[PDB]
Enzyme design. Structure first.
Site, mmCIF file in Angstrom:
data_model
loop_
_atom_site.group_PDB
_atom_site.id
_atom_site.type_symbol
_atom_site.label_atom_id
_atom_site.label_comp_id
_atom_site.label_asym_id
_atom_site.label_seq_id
_atom_site.Cartn_x
_atom_site.Cartn_y
_atom_site.Cartn_z
ATOM 1 C CE1 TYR A 88 -7.411 -5.421 1.641
ATOM 2 C CE2 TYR A 88 -6.310 -3.838 0.141
ATOM 3 C CZ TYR A 88 -6.675 -5.142 0.480
ATOM 4 O OH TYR A 88 -6.327 -6.164 -0.311
ATOM 5 C CG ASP A 105 -2.252 -0.806 0.913
ATOM 6 O OD1 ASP A 105 -2.425 -1.375 -0.189
ATOM 7 O OD2 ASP A 105 -3.081 -0.883 1.843
#
Ligand SMILES: *[C@@H]1O[C@H](CO)[C@@H](O[C@@H]2O[C@H](CO)[C@@H](O[C@@H]3O[C@H](CO)[C@@H](O)[C@H](O)[C@@H]3O)[C@H](O)[C@H]2NC(C)=O)[C@H](O)[C@H]1NC(C)=O
Ligand SMILES: *[C@@H]1O[C@H](CO)[C@@H](O[C@@H]2O[C@H](CO)[C@@H](O)[C@H](O)[C@H]2NC(C)=O)[C@H](O)[C@H]1NC(C)=O
Ligand SMILES: *[C@@H]1O[C@H](CO)[C@@H](O[C@@H]2O[C@H](CO)[C@@H](O)[C@H](O)[C@H]2NC(C)=O)[C@H](O)[C@H]1NC(C)=O
Ligand SMILES: *[C@@H]1O[C@H](CO)[C@@H](O[C@@H]2O[C@H](CO)[C@@H](O)[C@H](O)[C@H]2NC(C)=O)[C@H](O)[C@H]1NC(C)=O
Ligand SMILES: *[C@@H]1O[C@H](CO)[C@@H](O[C@@H]2O[C@H](CO)[C@@H](O)[C@H](O)[C@H]2NC(C)=O)[C@H](O)[C@H]1NC(C)=O
Ligand SMILES: *[C@@H]1O[C@H](CO)[C@@H](O[C@@H]2O[C@H](CO)[C@@H](O)[C@H](O)[C@H]2NC(C)=O)[C@H](O)[C@H]1NC(C)=O
Ligand code: CA
Ligand code: CA
Ligand code: CA
Ligand code: CA
Ligand code: CU
Ligand code: CU
Lengths: 710, 714
Positions: free
Chosen positions: B424, B336
């Site tokens: 997420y 990420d």
């Protein structure tokens, strides 16, 4: 209520059982307070749970209320061959029988095994006072304190257990301390071994004495060698170091009270007697005087998850340089872990907004004793949303924000056996997750400093060693996932290495799902050597709407390891601590992993958890019981003065639904908020409960601190 | 203010840096939003921390303020050999240079390694609209949705990374989905592999097609075989009364109604912490913080009791490593930081994300933007009761009464932000307890990464809905923990319990088998690099040579809360990107060239990334009396289950670690708290309640709820 089947005895019921037994004149019953061991006395009375077979017929199949009974532990000390015998006394109401429990052919040490009592302590103090008379000047010169004409400068002692080196002995090492605020931290360097096995306290004797690293044989000998200059002596208004009173200054002092919970709209849970409703949850609870807190008949969404979740034992196992220190293996059920549920201070022990519950115990008392604020029940914000999502449009805005404020229901009690304060929590989240937690605080078990002590602990003050130890706690987790008959399986990630299906010259090395089934008890008895599988699942043969077995997952939060060598002496008392997880087939003869007797006869106790696995039974589609060991090594450090603190000092486990519900069961919650954008307007804040800014005041602080008959 | 040295760039500073680069006409800079890849653009600007040596001399020895600079990442697409080059721009204020930064000469694949952008996504959508024309009728028949001529029934895609099978490739698998509420959970069964490496989007091609369990080579081929009735197709029901399964909207009813709002925090006295800019004081604690746009939350120069404990504790990388039955699924290893983990700090909702009583803080990011962007309520800082006392004791007299009750109400300070990269939502906390304990925690929520159901998918995940598999994955997070325990020079030791077997000293016929305290000293990096196979010692101690008054070395203990394990095989292909994930704990000697364990480039070139953590251990340096850095991997396997619908929830889905003083202070450092209450008995009278702060019953209200939801330049 139906939950009344699980309820502890009322004050009326305790009196009824006690009166019934007392009217049997052949028992020769006397009060717990009578200052002789040569007496017959009722030591403990508590509700004795009915058989599960009968309870489930009443709950699930609309049959007769089970017969209600009391367990009564009687110390028979007023006879030629003293023993402890237990009885089931019933029925309640209107007791008229007294049926002997758990016979044990060939066992001779039941008397030696019994817990120490207040009367016994008073007799030990008198023995100590008399036996140490030759040391009076030694005490005054070395400590400024004594046992005689001492007033505000008195010596005290802390006994350790077990008490001897074999089944049947009652020989206690006593740590002599200055009786000041937080006396636990004030050892004088003297320890004494007292044989107090005889029912005649006149016969009790100091058999050995230890002082500042040397053994002396008797108080007289220590006194003589002191006089002849043959003893290496250690001669021992800000707050005392052992006090909680503030001292020192923060670099950025804080002058006001911190934020507090308000509950202006009242509790969102429903408490009726020992029965709780909270959103999807329904359960009953009890506080078992011997073993401590339980939740029973736990349901979510009208379906059973667990028949029983209960504290079974709490142990602190020491090493030491001193005799008392190397002797110490404390097993707190042996001290009435569920009876030292002392008053919860509102605002501190539970939120100011908590519902505080009283109970009654009959444990080493003359009458049932009222324990105010023995438990509390409360909802509190967790400070983290249960779920949230920001759905960006990735062009400077959003499609929506959705969030559910985090709330939890906490049922709490404590045990303060002596120096330890354990805080026992069962915690219920709106999405069907429940948690068990124990937090450790209070005073550490400590002994007198000598250089040699640094191999078994840490120096914490001038005369103080904090002994190394491991805390271990055992829970019984009788999961009945969607019904009584379950199976147990685990899941692991396993790698595969395959041809990349869209680029044949390359490989794909990736996770696959690996499922392991368990057929026999022994396969599901996980030792500390083996790493625990990541998914520990208790399954129903029922499938959810997507084809997967409905299950609950057990997730353990622990730092525990194997502490004692399996098979060696006192380890027989704690064979459950071999297993972070073990699964057994339900049996009425295996309801408890410990007992009040284990502490004082750990060599030959009446329950050996390991024996539950001997028959290595089939556990495919059976009534299963999970048993969980959690704990942590505690090497004391200076920050433990005056007390060990709770942050980072908790252990326990989670129980989480795993393919049990069709989707997130918190979806029924009306607390959810979704924020939607509108074209050239304000956002639409979609709610199902109005926004609230009401404030209110909790009751003013009060604390009683006494626990007495009513 | 001194903490300004650690402060993120202001809106004005970001503009000043952007202006300075744009003034250099030879850079030919165009806006991020221009929809060609063949452009030069400034992709990211963020504050570039000065050298530790200079910061410490400033903070501790009265030397000059270090020079302030910004990191500037420039995409050079407008040239024959496109690349990514970074610069340090300074000084601030008054930028007049751009020096080279992180130079990696002899490396050629920087362009392929670069993050994806809004502009690139638009060109991907255009490519798909054209390439999938043959499938238009197929789309309408099977899904009721389309790429061409759509309005409210649009197909969307989710791209997986990395994007190929070797360094230098940019070939992405795209999971096709219906664009509805919670679109993440609405795959169509189609997945497309697009080569989008060229800077000319006209060369981009759908090179492969997967649909419902078979590969097809091209869109035209699937269209033909569909027409000829040769495809086993799955016709999805129409998604557009009851909420969509992927909605957060309530449905069902609790059997015991909850109609009123729950308990909530009030703060009538206001914050007990002192927050000023990026500097915080809280009882014993002092620290600065920042939100690095690339990597995320950091606390810096952390002190307790006026002594330094940690120079830096920061988020380094957050990974989700998948398996799958579909090509997209088996490709997915999301890192990420390659998506701007620190830049997706979206608006926190008061009363939900943080308490209503929290102090909410705005920031600015410049990440794939035409101008610095304002992020409202990117962070919050708040004190909350923990619901458990920090310490308490009931001192019984064992005869129906007591000598005293003592207790200290539990409170903690929480600094929090989030990262919502795509599906997420990670919630990032640093937590400070009044007794000198600090905790790092990450909570996972939001939507799972999901693919189209087939029976074969059950080997790599869980069926969550009719057409939906939740893929098996592991979450792994890396933290940098530059502990400076009472100063820069530390050592590292561990403690274990070991049994001894001795003669019972008062009963010679018997034994005492008992715990002793065993201490292990560490001399070299490799000794303190604990792999996941190894047993982690129960006491991990970072020590100062100074002793407390009882003769014990002053130390801080690191305690890890994780379920993580080795996921990828050490040494195999993409694992080179996450070699830190071999170690729950590794200790390195401090070095300015080793400040980070990941980068924004790791995601798209995991085979040959600019930083390989394992290389920090190669030289096996001495770690006695040295500036040490602890690096911590935490994580959990996540096998999705039906309760994850619509969102993964936070209970039992957090990981992190604790830092705890261990013989650092002479006694409990919370003793300076005046919140302590002691109740004492009095003969024939009420108890005396001893206090140092008056009892509070006051009331207040927080502001009414508001939420904006937009993030734009100012
Ligand atoms: C990545 O791309 C950048 C920008 O295109 C490269 O930096 C640039 O390198 C060129 C060639 O060395 C420089 O161009 C000019 O060359 C003439 C002579 O041929 C020289 O006299 C000029 O002074 C000028 O240097 C240019 O300065 C330079 N631009 C910047 C902003 O640094 C970079 O070299 C590329 N990286 C790699 C690894 O190839
Ligand atoms: C423990 O002592 C109890 C009480 O003295 C014994 O129980 C008694 O046994 C006598 C002799 O058989 C009976 O006549 C009495 O009725 C019993 N009393 C009660 C109150 O039940 C018992 O035998 C001893 N237990 C063991 C294991 O030796
Ligand atoms: C995954 O499997 C492949 C093929 O079985 C392994 O690659 C082989 O490895 C050996 C030794 O390095 C080479 O000599 C062969 O040429 C390889 N074969 C192919 C087809 O590539 C690979 O090492 C395995 N990887 C892991 C992590 O297990
Ligand atoms: C601790 O040490 C003692 C003494 O060395 C061990 O006791 C011996 O055990 C063997 C059987 O293995 C007997 O044959 C000997 O008679 C024992 N010796 C004595 C002096 O008692 C004991 O087993 C050890 N315990 C552990 C747990 O290691
Ligand atoms: C703690 O509780 C006890 C019991 O409720 C209190 O004692 C009672 O006080 C009432 C009210 O004055 C008297 O009428 C009773 O005679 C007392 N009962 C008993 C059993 O003693 C006591 O006052 C409380 N103590 C404190 C410090 O608040
Ligand atoms: C979100 O915040 C933005 C930025 O502050 C608000 O946009 C401004 O709105 C006011 C009118 O209320 C105008 O005067 C400005 O021109 C707007 N500025 C920009 C940059 O667009 C917006 O109103 C807020 N949105 C919501 C839904 O509350
Ligand atoms: Ca069995
Ligand atoms: Ca069961
Ligand atoms: Ca190194
Ligand atoms: Ca350091
Ligand atoms: Cu402890
Ligand atoms: Cu996940």
């Amino acid at each position: 209520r139906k939950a009344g089947v699980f309820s502890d005895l009322s004050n009326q019921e305790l009196k009824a059982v006690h009166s019934f037994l007392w009217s049997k004149k052949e028992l020769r019953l006397q009060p717990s307070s009578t200052t002789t061991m040569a007496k017959n006395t009722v030591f403990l009375i508590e509700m004795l749970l009915p058989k599960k077979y009968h309870v489930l017929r009443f709950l699930d199949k609309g049959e007769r209320h089970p017969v209600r009974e009391a367990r009564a532990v009687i110390f028979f000390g007023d006879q030629e061959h003293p023993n402890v015998t237990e009885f089931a006394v019933g029925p309640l109401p209107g007791p008229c029988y007294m049926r002997a429990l758990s016979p044990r052919p060939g066992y001779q040490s039941s008397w030696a095994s019994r817990p120490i009592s207040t009367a016994e302590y008073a007799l030990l103090y008198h023995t100590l006072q008399e036996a140490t008379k030759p040391l009076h000047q030694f005490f005054l010169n070395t400590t400024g304190f004594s046992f005689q004409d001492c007033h505000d400068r008195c010596l005290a002692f802390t006994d350790v257990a077990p008490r001897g080196v074999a089944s049947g002995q009652r020989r206690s090492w006593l740590i002599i301390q200055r009786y000041v605020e937080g006396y636990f931290l004030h050892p004088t360097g003297l320890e004494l071994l007292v044989d107090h096995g005889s029912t005649d306290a006149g016969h009790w004797a100091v058999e050995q004495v230890w002082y500042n690293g040397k053994f002396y044989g008797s108080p007289e000998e220590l006194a003589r060698k002191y006089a002849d200059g043959e003893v290496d002596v250690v001669v021992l208004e800000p707050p005392l170091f052992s006090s909680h009173k503030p001292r020192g200054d923060f670099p950025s002092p804080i002058h006001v009270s911190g934020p507090r919970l308000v509950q202006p709209h009242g509790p969102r849970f429903r408490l009726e007697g020992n029965a709780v409703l909270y959103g999807g949850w329904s359960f009953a609870f009890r506080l078992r005087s011997s073993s401590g807190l339980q939740v029973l008949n736990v349901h979510f969404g009208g379906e059973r998850i667990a028949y029983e979740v209960s504290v079974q034992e709490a142990v602190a196992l020491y090493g030491g340089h001193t005799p008392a220190g190397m002797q110490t293996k404390y097993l707190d059920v042996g001290w009435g872990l569920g009876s030292v549920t002392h008053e919860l201070a509102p605002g501190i022990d539970c939120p100011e907004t908590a519902t505080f519950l009283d109970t009654f115990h009959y444990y080493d008392a003359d009458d049932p004793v009222h324990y105010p604020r023995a438990l509390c029940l409360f909802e509190m914000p967790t400070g983290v949303p249960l779920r949230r999502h920001f759905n960006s449009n990735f062009k400077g805005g959003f499609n929506f924000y959705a969030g559910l404020k985090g709330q939890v229901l906490v049922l709490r009690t404590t045990s303060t056996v002596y120096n330890y304060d354990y805080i026992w929590d069962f915690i219920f989240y709106p999405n069907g997750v429940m948690e068990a937690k124990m937090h450790a605080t209070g005073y550490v078990h400590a002994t007198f400093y000598t250089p040699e002590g640094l191999r078994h602990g840490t120096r914490l003050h001038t005369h103080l060693i904090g002994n190394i130890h491991t805390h271990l706690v055992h829970y019984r987790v009788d999961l009945d996932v969607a019904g009584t008959k379950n199976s147990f399986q685990t899941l692991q990630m396993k790698l595969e290495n395959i041809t990349n299906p869209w680029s044949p010259r390359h490989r794909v090395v990736q996770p696959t799902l690996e499922q392991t089934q368990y057929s026999w008890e022994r396969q599901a008895a996980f030792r500390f050597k083996r790493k625990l599988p990541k998914y520990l699942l208790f399954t129903s043969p029922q499938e959810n709407p997507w084809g997967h077995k409905r299950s609950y997952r057990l997730q353990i939060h622990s730092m525990a390891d194997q502490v004692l060598p399996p098979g060696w002496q006192e380890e027989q008392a704690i064979t459950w601590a071999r297993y972070p997880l073990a699964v057994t087939k339900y049996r009425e003869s295996e309801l408890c992993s410990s007992s009040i007797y284990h502490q004082n006869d750990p060599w030959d106790p009446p329950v050996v958890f390991e024996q539950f696995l001997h028959n290595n039974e089939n556990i495919e589609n059976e009534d299963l019981v999970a048993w969980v060991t959690v704990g942590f090594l505690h090497i004391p450090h200076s920050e433990d003065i005056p007390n060990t603190a709770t942050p980072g000092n908790s252990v326990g486990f989670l129980l989480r639904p795993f393919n049990f519900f069709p989707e997130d069961p918190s979806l029924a919650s009306r607390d959810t908020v979704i924020v939607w954008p509108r074209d050239n307007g304000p956002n639409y804040v979609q709610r199902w409960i109005p926004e609230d800014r009401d404030c209110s005041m909790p009751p003013p602080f009060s604390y009683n601190g006494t626990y007495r008959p009513v």
